[PDB]
Amino acid sequence: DWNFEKMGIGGLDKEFSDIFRRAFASRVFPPEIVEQMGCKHVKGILLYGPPGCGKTLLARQIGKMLNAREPKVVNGPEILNKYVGESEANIRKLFADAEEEQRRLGA
Amino acid sequence: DWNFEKMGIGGLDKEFSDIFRRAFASRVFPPEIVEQMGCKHVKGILLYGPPGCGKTLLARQIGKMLNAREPKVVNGPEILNKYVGESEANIRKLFADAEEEQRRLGANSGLHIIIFDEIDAICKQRGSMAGSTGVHDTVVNQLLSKIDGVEQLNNILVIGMTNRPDLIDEALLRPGRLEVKMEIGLPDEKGRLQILHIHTARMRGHQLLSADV
Amino acid sequence: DWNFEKMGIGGLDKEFSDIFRRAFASRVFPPEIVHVKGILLYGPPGCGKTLLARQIGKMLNAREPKVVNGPEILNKYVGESEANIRKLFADAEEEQRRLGANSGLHIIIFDEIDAICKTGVHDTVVNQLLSKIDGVEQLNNILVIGMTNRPDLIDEALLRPGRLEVKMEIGLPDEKGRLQILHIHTARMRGHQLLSADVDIKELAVETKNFSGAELEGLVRAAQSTAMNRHIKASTKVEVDMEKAESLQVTRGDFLASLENDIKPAFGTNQEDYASYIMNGIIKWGDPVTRVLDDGELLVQQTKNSDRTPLVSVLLEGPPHSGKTALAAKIAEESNFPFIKICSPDKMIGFSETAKCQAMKKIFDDAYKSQLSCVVVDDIERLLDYVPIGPRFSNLVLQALLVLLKKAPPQGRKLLIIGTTSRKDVLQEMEMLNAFSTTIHVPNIATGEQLLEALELLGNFKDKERTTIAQQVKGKKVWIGIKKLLMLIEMSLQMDPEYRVRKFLALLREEGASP
Amino acid sequence: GNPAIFASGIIMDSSISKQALSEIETRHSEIIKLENSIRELHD
Amino acid sequence: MAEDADMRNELEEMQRRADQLADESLESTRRMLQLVEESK
Ligand SMILES: Nc1ncnc2c1ncn2[C@@H]1O[C@H](COP(=O)(O)OP(=O)(O)OP(=O)(O)O)[C@@H](O)[C@H]1O
Ligand SMILES: Nc1ncnc2c1ncn2[C@@H]1O[C@H](COP(=O)(O)OP(=O)(O)OP(=O)(O)O)[C@@H](O)[C@H]1O
Ligand SMILES: Nc1ncnc2c1ncn2[C@@H]1O[C@H](COP(=O)(O)OP(=O)(O)OP(=O)(O)O)[C@@H](O)[C@H]1O
Ligand SMILES: Nc1ncnc2c1ncn2[C@@H]1O[C@H](COP(=O)(O)OP(=O)(O)OP(=O)(O)O)[C@@H](O)[C@H]1O
Structure with a gap:
């Protein structure tokens, strides 16, 4: 139950389209073709301005x-001790x- | 069960051949000629680029x-406590x-592999460091003693990688500890x-x- | 045994004998006529x-020594x-208390001792060791050996007499x-x-400079590896010879390859340039060169044998591209003095005045030490950067030179200075031409005969072309420097054989000029 | 001169130990036996 | 770092155990004094 108009972001159509294409395209398709094509997913995004x-x-x-687990969030330098x-x-x-989840359930 | 092709390393051909020649030729041929010739095996590698x-x-x-025991991995400075x-x-x-293995089975034991990653995060020059705590110096001294100490251990192999070779202390980079120091570069x-193929x-x-590609 | 080589150790024979003399003399000496409990090694x-x-x-002949591998104490x-x-x-x-004097020797080994000795834990451990080694109870049957690679990081109080007595330094063989070691x-x-049979150990020993034992053993090992790989094939399934493995001869070429590619001394190198200042040699295209060289020899002997003129100076004058620096280098090399050096502006680029002054001072200070020495300075005007507009230049360097030109060295030593420039009038105006003792003149090529002789010596043109060149040149005067002549010849040779001559002559006409 | 400098990390050091705690068990155990004895005497 | 997190936990747990042991010994000592006084 998701819709683009729901998020209420304006003026950033192109950037969102590019991010979607280059990040989430791989994970949405049936997995057989992806597996035959033999690539690994992307695991990074940076935003500046x-x-x-x-x-x-x-x-x-x-x-x-x-549809995933609750994201972890780090507010600036919360890690120094x-x-x-x-x-x-x-x-x-x-x-x-x-x-642990990768080691247990694999793919 | 091994072949050159299956590893899939494109731009490095002379480098891998040099590694094989200078590190593994000893452990392939029959032990008789080696023992007759009385030489020692290498015990280190340092890559960088x-x-x-x-x-x-x-x-x-x-x-x-x-074909040996599973290698042990040290992901960065995961030793400090x-x-x-x-x-x-x-x-x-x-x-x-x-x-333990060397003591028990003497000279006919298997091989063991240890991989240090981001080594320069631990082994910096002893003198040139913030003179606040001595933990780093003790760590370096322990490693130097254990790798090559009075007691002789000769069935181990250590590989290390980094990005700034200079910072490593010199005492570690001399023959007997880490001698074969190669450089990787742009193809x-x-x-x-x-690689593209x-x-x-x-x-x-x-x-x-x-087909148009 | 005391041979020191039956144990497979070389170079430290004298140090080993010193250890014998100073360490075990008391123990081996008869007890009736009759200790040291500290040893530190570094290198x-x-x-x-x-x-x-x-x-x-x-x-x-004592119990098994005990050893500790680095810091195995802190907990x-x-x-x-x-x-x-x-x-x-x-x-x-226990042994001292029970057997008293007749107690066996005890040996203790401290490996990487610098790690533990140098916060409460550390200083408490150091104090405990100091008390135990030298405390209220005095023991005479214990021996302690420490090893370090950084002698400066050891605590001083540990090195006092009675705790650490015998200190040894191990150096490069x-x-x-x-x-x-090779044997x-x-x-x-x-x-x-x-x-x-092709390997000569002496050649390798001469070649191997500043190689500690590690370096030499590694070179040997690399030769082993080369020979060893000569008999293996890698790609499909690692496969070896098993056939020529019987021969496995180690050729000298393997040693050379190992020394060249996969070994390095790890010490800095020294770069020389004195050769670079005379590239094409000297060719006698006329009388003047002989006169210049003879005057140089005369000045050299005057400085060598004079008694009350320990300092002498000369200046070399000539128009541009006349090849002045090369003659100075040749004279300096003929001088045959223990100390020779060349000061050039090439190495000083982007420097401020103070840097130039300090560099010159350092060079002259070094020159002072030896008995008799010679120094040469070239392109003075470039040294004290000079520009016709204004004019503008650096006063500080000029004053430094003027002072240095007439300072006699310490007693009983001799110095010679040779200067080269191409603008005499400027130096005269700055009142520097008076400082020098004498001057020499370097001319250009004047007559066509000299040019023809130079061409003949170079041997870049044949008789046919030389005939036309002689026809065109002998009826006229010329004015050209040798360097420009070489540049022109190289310029001309590019084009096809048909036109070279004409092109060359055209270029000459372009540079045709008079003094 | 030098701006104010930060302090370095701390390295604490625990006191009690497993084997020293076995020794403390040695200490403690005899007390209960001695207690049984004194209780017997009083009884 | 949960690997060392458990070592610290064990250390502190044995600290607590030692504290309890000392308190038990002290209470014992007091009881001994009481009974020994009583018999007289
Ligand atoms: N494209 C947009 N469409 C709608 N509202 C927007 C948009 N950009 C910003 N806003 C509004 O302005 C606010 C700006 O907050 P935002 O989190 O974007 O700041 P920021 O970029 O994180 O700030 P900083 O750069 O200082 O970290 C949003 O919370 C929202 O209310
Ligand atoms: N010569 C090569 N042949 C084939 N693939 C290569 C080659 N070099 C790099 N790659 C590919 O590119 C990536 C290289 O990542 P890798 O971690 O090996 O580089 P790295 O040198 O360790 O990086 P870093 O310098 O950050 O440590 C991998 O995905 C690998 O498959
Ligand atoms: N003079 C020598 N004679 C024979 N072998 C030598 C000699 N010098 C070094 N070696 C070789 O070096 C190794 C022994 O050197 P060792 O480890 O004792 O050196 P070190 O200088 O005391 O140590 P470090 O480099 O850790 O300070 C052996 O491989 C030995 O063959
Ligand atoms: N007889 C000779 N005399 C001088 N130089 C010669 C002679 N024969 C060949 N040469 C070569 O001519 C070149 C001389 O050039 P040099 O640098 O000495 O010129 P220069 O007079 O110092 O010029 P500049 O004032 O432009 O620096 C050198 O290559 C030298 O080898």
């Missing part, structure tokens, strides 16, 4: 887009669920 | 090639198994053709590519 | 300190480090040591005749 143009809005709306070797701990705590 | 060239791919493929004197325990845990026209094979296999 | 990596420690431990618990360190000395104390590592090959 001057203040007040609609970046965080896009992030939030994409978060509400997908005073003790030795704790920052890396906070960083590696992020990917645990993906690691 | 600009980003996105194929280092990690090469290391993983090398690990896959050999806050309790004093706990990093060294983590480091020694790696070589514990190899030492040439032929390498580009080989490699990544396009399956499409051609299933006739999903237009 | 650059890959010199064999581990070898020395192991062999010294093996040599003595997150409190006090366990002290317990661990104290655990080491229990046997020595000499040619003889390199020869010994040791190749004796195995020579025993089984697996070595080729």
